[PDB]
Amino acid sequence: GPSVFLFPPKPKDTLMISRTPEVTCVVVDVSHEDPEVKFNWYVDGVEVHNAKTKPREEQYNSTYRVVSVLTVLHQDWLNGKEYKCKVSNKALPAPIEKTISKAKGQPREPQVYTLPPSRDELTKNQVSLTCLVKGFYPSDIAVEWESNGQPENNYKTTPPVLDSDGSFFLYSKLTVDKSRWQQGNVFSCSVMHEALHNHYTQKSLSL
Amino acid sequence: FNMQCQRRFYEALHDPNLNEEQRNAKIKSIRDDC
Numbered sequence: 001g002p003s004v005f006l007f008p009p010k011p012k013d014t015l016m017i018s019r020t021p022e023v024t025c026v027v028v029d030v031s032h033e034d035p036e037v038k039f040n041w042y043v044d045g046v047e048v049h050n051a052k053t054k055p056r057e058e059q060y061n062s063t064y065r066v067v068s069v070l071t072v073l074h075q076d077w078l079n080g081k082e083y084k085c086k087v088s089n090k091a092l093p094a095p096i097e098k099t100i101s102k103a104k105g106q107p108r109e110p111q112v113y114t115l116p117p118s119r120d121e122l123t124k125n126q127v128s129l130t131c132l133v134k135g136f137y138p139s140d141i142a143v144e145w146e147s148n149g150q151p152e153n154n155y156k157t158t159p160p161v162l163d164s165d166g167s168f169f170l171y172s173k174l175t176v177d178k179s180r181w182q183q184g185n186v187f188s189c190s191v192m193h194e195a196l197h198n199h200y201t202q203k204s205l206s207l
Numbered sequence: 208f209n210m211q212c213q214r215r216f217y218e219a220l221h222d223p224n225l226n227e228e229q230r231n232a233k234i235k236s237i238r239d240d241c
């Protein structure tokens with residue numbers, strides 16, 4: 001009958017105490033006929049009861065999409081606890097169980113390197129400010145940019161890439177008007193990862 | 208975000224003199240009062 005997909009929290013949400021990390025259990029292909037969907041949640045096998053189901057919404061293909069959101073403690077996810085979502089529905093021979101947890105392996109600290117634009121790029125009105133982050137593990141990481149204390153938002157970051165030593169790397173590219181760079185403005189690449197002190201570091205870049 | 212709170216969070220998460228219950232208690236207090 002229905003299918004289940006279990007999603008982890010965003011890397012930033014488990015690293016910053018200001019955020020509230022959530023695990024999301026998504027059920028699709030729930031029929032009109034058998035619409036009842038029951039969720040059971042366990043952390044390392046112990047059932048938990050703070051899960052909240054969101055309003056379901058019928059889909060363009062005439063099935064129900066039902067979602068249960070489970071808030072989790074930052075420490076538990078980081079310390080490897082297993083989150084299991086149990087979904088019960090009448091169209092199933094049996095309940096479907098999906099499990100997720102942080103990747104295993106010793107965490108490795110990211111090295112953060114800011115790189116100015118290539119001189120060849122100065123012929124354009126916009127330049128690229130680059131932030132290379134390498135040697136980190138697990139691949140869960142968050143990267144942002146700011147200037148003067150405010151958030152530079154015109155950036156894009158590549159997904160993590162597995163390196164030859166088993167760690168990961170990525171590049172974040174912030175695009176700014178060439179004038180802003182030429183004027184001496186200072187930019188900062190902020191990186192959040194479990195293996196960094198305070199789960200946070202910043203590296204500046206300026207002319 | 209408040210960096211002070213983040214520092215206290217990280218410190219409590221890695222304090223070796225705490226067991227799971229105490230770590231959880233300390234982190235929750237840091238979470239609510241800042």
Ligand SMILES: *[C@@H]1O[C@H](CO[C@H]2O[C@@H](C)[C@@H](O)[C@@H](O)[C@@H]2O)[C@@H](O[C@@H]2O[C@H](CO)[C@@H](O[C@@H]3O[C@H](CO[C@H]4O[C@H](CO)[C@@H](O)[C@H](O)[C@@H]4O[C@@H]4O[C@H](CO)[C@@H](O[C@@H]5O[C@H](CO)[C@H](O)[C@H](O)[C@H]5O)[C@H](O)[C@H]4NC(C)=O)[C@@H](O)[C@H](O[C@H]4O[C@H](CO)[C@@H](O)[C@H](O)[C@@H]4O[C@@H]4O[C@H](CO)[C@@H](O[C@@H]5O[C@H](CO)[C@H](O)[C@H](O)[C@H]5O)[C@H](O)[C@H]4NC(C)=O)[C@@H]3O)[C@H](O)[C@H]2NC(C)=O)[C@H](O)[C@H]1NC(C)=O
Pocket residue numbers: 003005007008009010021022023024026028029059060061063065
């Ligand atoms: C009906 O209809 C419906 C609806 O639809 C829709 O869409 C469109 C297109 C159209 O269609 C219309 O209609 C509408 O609109 C449907 O549904 C569907 O279904 C499907 C199925 O079929 C599904 O799929 C799935 O997907 C997934 C993904 O997802 C995501 O994404 C997407 C896009 O991109 C979207 O859409 C969704 O939604 C999602 O999203 C997400 O979400 C989440 C939750 O919510 C989130 O998170 C959250 O968030 C929040 C904020 O907001 C916070 O943060 C929290 O915290 C969190 O949690 C996120 O964010 C989001 N994202 C984004 C990006 O957006 C995927 O993944 C999957 O895939 C999988 O599966 C498949 C099959 O099926 C395959 O193929 C693939 O490959 C995969 O697989 C997998 O693999 C893996 C590997 O990699 C494995 O595991 C492994 O194992 C190993 C061992 O050796 C190791 O261990 C490793 O580690 C691991 O990993 C596994 O097992 C596998 N799996 C399986 C199952 O097998 C899929 O694809 C979808 O989703 C849906 N949609 C929706 C919307 O829902 C239906 O279908 C229809 N029906 C009919 C009949 O037709």
